[model samples]
Target: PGPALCLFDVDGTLTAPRQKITKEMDDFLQKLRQKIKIGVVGGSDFEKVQEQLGNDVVEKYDYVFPENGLVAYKDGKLLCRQNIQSHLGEALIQDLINYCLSYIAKIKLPKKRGTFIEFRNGMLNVSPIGRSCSQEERIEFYELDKKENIRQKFVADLRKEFAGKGLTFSIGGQISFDVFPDGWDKRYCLRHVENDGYKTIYFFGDKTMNDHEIFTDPRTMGYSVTAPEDTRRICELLFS
Candidate 1:
């Protein structure tokens, strides 16, 4: 009846650990769907988002923004997408990858799951734990730093190195780093919808920090939920 209100973020916000959406979450979604437009936003890929949320859950939303805002999908169809290296050429990305590899070796961090390095076409994900590292280990790595300076340094270094490339980068949930070209992110995605005339917007994310360009702006109406590592705490944030 009125302008759309967006409910978003998949991991740790709509679903709990292990990618399971609890009954409480399900009930919330059901009620939320009736009140306004619903969608999921996450750092995950589209397939993974669908897998965790299931086709049925997706059918309830207006659309879904996946891959940390690199892609958009609506009603099981692709709507729009942005390339991470659209501004920078492949050569630049390759050089950045090489730099990341050398940096990883210098830092002596463990390899992650899927791949030590992931090239998401538009963005790059450097996981401290190899691609296949268990989720637990990933969480442990982030918490290990007493001052959390290790994560901050990696993000800052990547930003500095890619500054001239017109790329935007930030550290997201767990122990990972992400790089995107300027003009793309969750907040940007929200603004895109708002510009289309949807006024009432709400966001749910676990990694809402002011320092991070992607999540910094208050005008975007971003709301912080609990991280996946803290199930009990998330329950409190949601139900309590």
Candidate 2:
């Protein structure tokens, strides 16, 4: 009914951690699209976002900002895309990758698998449990991390070591963390939303850290949600 836009985080806010979204929630989003513009942003690459949200993700939403808006799609057409290599250059990328590989070698975990470092177009997803771990193994590491602060300590060390290198480390989802350039958080997508001339932009996310920038930005009214159901709850009260 107004020039309102709703941007959502694809992980916990739309689906359970690393799981496909439910049909009910997908249908609700379609219904809600009747009233306002809808979009989704995530730290994951577009392929991963499609795995969780469905392959027709770009066509399903008004905007699809994958890789924290490093890649963007509008109305099912490519709007723009950005990459780490071009932004950070090969020298820095190699250094970050080499350091991560060495660091993972020393970590003593119950199980370690392949793809510890996932190089995305936008960020580096560092997974202690490895990106190829089974769902059970993923959960195992997540629970263990809760007790030992595995990811937290790793991010802190990276923060200190790369303090002046203009990298931002964010721990997200269940088993991995993201390292990207300073302005490349979820907030990077907002400019596109703003340029579209939407007066009111409402961002919904589950992680306070990942959502911190866009959630608190003066141009947005952010709603922090814990789960997909919580997101529906707020949408019902406000939009329905």
Candidate 3:
């Protein structure tokens, strides 16, 4: 067998809209363990990723990269986690959150679940529709009433407003924007593993193109497949 790393995206690519994982998908994962190094790269936190796939399913993989590559888990334990170095100051983070919150309120959008603002280590996430929203509602909200374009413009404005703050920002998934220190993203994470001479790098994602900086780059060499759910097809693609 050749040395290879098969990286997959969770949300829309590995599961359905409502975070549903099917039995067939589970079986596929179980079998996929037999070949190559398998891992998940997703935007959600690590715990949430575990919840979606269930504990047993996650235990079978080689690695789990969650929070869009902020953390990596392996062998049922947290292996490594990195915070954006440029955005590590507590005072700066506080100010950024406050500024973002005021802007969200100004837009009159519904508050996101968890908190109006989410502080994950050095990164800041602003969910336009509260964090506790159901997956369906989240999806609908992003796709509704030109919401997609609206969110894009909002992120653009945010970037413009916060320019030269020594922080980088990008829109994530649907109704959220992520503010992190510059140079932290899936591509950075991918680079760490790609040099090992993987036979094939197949990326399963729903919104890989959402950020032009990551997936659209020519440096990422892999077969990118867009799927609504992690299904039997993915299983077959990974194994037999």
Model 2 stretches with alpha carbons more than 4 Å out: 16-19, 95-118, 125-163, 170-178, 207-211
Which candidate would rank higher by lDDT, 1 or 2? Answer: 2
lDDT of 3 by residue, 1-240 (tens): 367666777766667755766777766666676766778877677678877777664576777877766787666677667775444666767677777777767765433455557767547777777666888877776776264475677678878877887677766576677788776666546755566677666565543464534555454434455564433465465566
Number of the top TM-score candidate: 2
How far out, in Å, is residue 5 in model 1? 1.4
**Cα TM-score of candidate 1:** 0.65
Model 3 clashing residue pairs (backbone) = 14-230, 111-130, 112-130, 112-131, 113-130, 113-131, 113-132
TM-score of 2: 0.71
lDDT of 1 by residue, 64-173 (tens): 78765567766656777777566577799788889888777676443444476787756777775656678777766767643456667877887787777777667667
Q: For each candidate, what TM-score against the reference?
A: 0.65, 0.71, 0.66
lDDT of 2 at 216: 87
User: Which candidate, 1 or 2, has the higher TM-score?
Assistant: 2
Give the Cα lDDT of each candidate: 0.65, 0.89, 0.65
Candidate 2 lDDT over 110-218, as tens digits, reads: 9999999987787899998899999999999999999999999999988887788899888878899989998887889987889777878998995466347888888
How much is 224 displaced in model 2, in angstroms?
A: 2.1
